[PDB]
Amino acid sequence: HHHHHH
Amino acid sequence: FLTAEDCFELGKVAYTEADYYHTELWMEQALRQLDEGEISTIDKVSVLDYLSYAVYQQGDLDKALLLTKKLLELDPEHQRANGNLKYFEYIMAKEKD
């Protein structure tokens, strides 16, 4: 996922 | 007529653009069409994945959490969703002060 925290 | 999949493609591109406002709008529309019984190659869980994080990115943690719980009702084993649940909860707890 693009802008994920991970 | 834009299909659930059409809405999803639009939302996905908004997402990458980080346009979270339009991600939420398109993903929401996708979901409603799905909820009403549209026959589509795209699934609810996938819409929810984007929708929940888009809502979070805009600062509505409460709503992000609900959508997350909703995804997990559908896919209890969902890895990202399970992570997101704990993360959202953590931030909310640390928020309450």
CB < 8 Å & 24+ apart, contacts of B11-20 = B11/B47, B11/B50, B11/B51, B11/B54, B12/B50, B15/A2, B15/A3, B15/B50, B15/B54, B16/A2, B18/A2, B18/A3, B18/B57, B20/B54, B20/B55, B20/B57, B20/B58
Chain B neighbors of A6, CB-CB under 8 A: 83
- 């399970």: which residue's tokens? B82
Give the tokens for residue B79.
């890895």
User: Which fold does the domain B1-97 belong to in CATH?
Assistant: 1.25.40
- 């890895």: which residue's tokens? B79
Chain A neighbors of B88, CB-CB under 8 A: none
Dist. CA B15–CA B13, nearest whole Å: 5
Contact, B71 vs B81, CB < 8 A? yes
Dist. CA B76–CA A1, nearest whole Å: 19
Q: Give the resolution in Å.
A: 2.0
The CA-CA-CA angle for residues B31, B55, B89, to 5°, reads: 115
Dist. CA B73–CA B59, nearest whole Å: 23
Dist. CA B32–CA B26, nearest whole Å: 10
Contact, B49 vs B80, CB < 8 A? yes
